[PDB]
Design a protein around this ligand. Structure first.
Ligand SMILES: COc1cc(F)ccc1-c1ccnc2nc([C@@H]3CC[C@@H](NC(C)=O)C3)[nH]c12
Lengths: 252, 298
């Protein structure tokens, strides 16, 4: 279905994790931690932000079916990334993903002997988890990201390199920090990112010659009311994230 | 013990017969509630040390993208409570089977229709930036209602715009010259050469060039299409020497129709750059002259 992986706010309140007693705020943090683990492992494994973003959507979607109480993020993230790197044409070896996941999760610990039963078991656990991910997602692995649509806007607005770079930053951070990927279509999310980047940079996109606003050329469902509501939500979580806004802050 | 709303157990289908005659496990099955016939292809886990085959992921991705009357329909992917199956809508026939059947008989009108559907399927897949890479009569399916479907996307891959794609593609008898000459920057023309071999097969009832090795294949191609020459194929200089094009002469016997012979000749062109595409092939007078293409009931 076209709306299979899009959920209402009520559907997000009554999540699989909620059924097992996980408070909403706790679940949001569990999601944010998984995204951070994916980013960390992805950078170390030298995979693209695209691959990382794909693994983040697999994670988000997986947890709309499964609970953090039965499947810890520290277990799912490596398997989600292992799968996303294959899907995105950057395959990384299973022993390689295990080596990296281990150092991220146990910086001071030492990787077991690759001949041990403890190690052979964690290799099997990843393969089993990849399989559970594939089945949970019903093998729907082709992800569309807001980034694709940001390119379209930043040209059809003649945005500075600066504005465009800030918009991609918003797009990536929306995956780490929000559940927008579970609620809004990638073109909508792309509009949210451009709108906030503009507000942040004090950039104003003028009204088209036809009397139409820029977003009307991107998505018919998009309204200023929604854009302001979503940019506010994204900005709030950004302000709560230590050092994140510093990355895009004009220090001059 | 884990919720799985979107991946049904294959036991919903009842195996009727193994049809995997060309190497994995392919079954004809029946939906236990509605009787709907399907084909179950098991994803082979033999010598798979990297979890779920990247090869299977690729095919599934491609099948999910390609939705067209002349492309096989992937219904869903099933699990077994541990294996995984690709589930397709079942097609009673395959072109290789129909052609090897002495009782089966095609009129010129029907041959026109088969080629039209095949070329329309290729136009679609290529438009979607997909290369089939395994064109052969056995991968051309035909429903009870005479609808042709391009099947087996197990070797298919997405292409773009210097590419380094795998050369070890296409069954020898259907393999184009480019590949036999070591090309890795190939595109849609590889599938169209296969279309040419199959078209000729609609009259000869047998694959026109049955080589035993790549060298034997290249020799066979030369005895039919003339010899590989920088004159014929500009910049090919990156075999047999005297050979002259006999595509129309050697097939003259079986085919008879002038238009059919002209199109086959345009499909079995040596230079991939000079080989006809699906769009121009569909525009060919072969599909726009009497007897006009007609529906299948033979
Ligand atoms: C090339 O086709 C496939 C290749 C695969 F790897 C997997 C599935 C198919 C496939 C899909 C759908 N319908 C089909 N029908 C056939 C057969 C064609 C002649 C019949 N043969 C017998 C022995 O009854 C059925 N194969 C089918």
């Amino acid at each position: 279905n076209n709306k299979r992986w899009y959920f209402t706010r009520e559907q997000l309140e009554n999540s699989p994790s909620r059924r097992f007693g996980v408070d909403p705020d706790k679940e949001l943090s569990y999601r944010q931690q998984a995204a951070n683990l994916l980013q960390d492992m992805g950078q170390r494994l030298n995979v693209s932000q695209l691959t990382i973003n794909t693994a983040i959507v697999y994670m988000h979607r997986f947890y709309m079916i499964q609970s953090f109480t039965r499947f810890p993020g520290n277990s799912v993230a490596p398997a989600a990334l292992f799968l996303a790197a294959k899907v995105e044409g950057q395959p990384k070896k299973l022993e390689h993903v295990i080596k990296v996941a281990h150092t991220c999760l146990h910086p001071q610990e030492s990787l077991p002997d690759t001949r041990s039963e403890a190690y052979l078991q964690q290799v099997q656990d990843l393969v089993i988890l990849e399989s559970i991910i594939l089945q949970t997602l019903g093998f729907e692995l082709t992800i569309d990201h807001p980034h694709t649509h940001v390119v379209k806007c930043t040209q059809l607005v003649r945005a500075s390199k600066d504005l465009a770079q800030t918009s991609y930053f918003m797009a990536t951070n929306s995956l780490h920090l929000t559940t927008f990927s579970l609620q809004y279509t990638p073109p909508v999310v792309a509009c949210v990112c451009i709108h906030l980047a503009c507000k942040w940079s004090n950039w104003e996109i003028p009204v088209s010659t036809d009397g139409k606003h820029w977003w009307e050329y991107v998505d018919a469902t998009v309204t200023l009311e929604l854009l302001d509501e979503l940019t506010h939500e994204l900005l709030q979580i950004l302000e709560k994230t230590p050092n994140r806004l510093k990355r895009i802050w004009n220090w001059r | 013990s884990v919720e799985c709303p979107f991946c049904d157990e294959v036991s919903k289908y009842e195996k009727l017969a193994k049809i995997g005659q060309g190497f994995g496990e392919v079954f004809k099955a029946r939906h236990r509630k509605t009787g709907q016939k399907v084909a179950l292809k098991k994803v082979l886990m033999e010598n798979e040390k990297e979890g779920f085959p990247i090869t299977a992921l690729r095919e599934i991705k491609i099948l999910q993208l390609l939705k067209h009357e002349n492309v096989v329909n992937l219904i869903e992917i099933c699990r077994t409570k541990g294996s995984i199956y690709l589930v397709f809508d079942f097609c009673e026939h395959d072109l290789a089977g129909l052609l090897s059947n002495v009782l089966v008989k095609f009129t010129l009108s029907e041959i026109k229709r088969v080629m039209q559907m095949l070329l329309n399927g290729l136009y679609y897949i290529h438009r979607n930036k997909i290369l089939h890479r395994d064109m052969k009569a056995a991968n051309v399916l035909i429903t009870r209602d005479g609808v042709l479907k391009l099947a087996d996307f197990g070797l298919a891959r997405a292409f773009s715009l210097p590419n380094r794609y795998t050369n070890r593609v296409v069954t020898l008898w259907y393999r184009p010259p480019e590949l036999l000459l070591g090309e890795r920057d190939y595109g849609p023309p590889i599938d169209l050469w296969g279309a040419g071999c199959i078209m000729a097969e609609m009259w000869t009832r047998s694959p026109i060039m049955q080589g035993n090795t790549e060298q034997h294949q290249l020799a066979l191609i030369s005895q039919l299409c003339g010899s590989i020459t920088p004159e014929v194929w500009p910049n090919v200089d990156n075999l047999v020497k005297g050979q002259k094009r006999k595509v129309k002469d050697r097939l003259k016997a079986y085919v008879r129709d002038p238009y059919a012979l002209d199109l086959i000749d345009k499909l079995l062109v040596l230079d991939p750059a000079q080989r006809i595409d699906s769009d121009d092939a569909l525009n060919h007078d072969f599909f726009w002259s009497d007897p006009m293409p007609s529906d299948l009931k033979g």
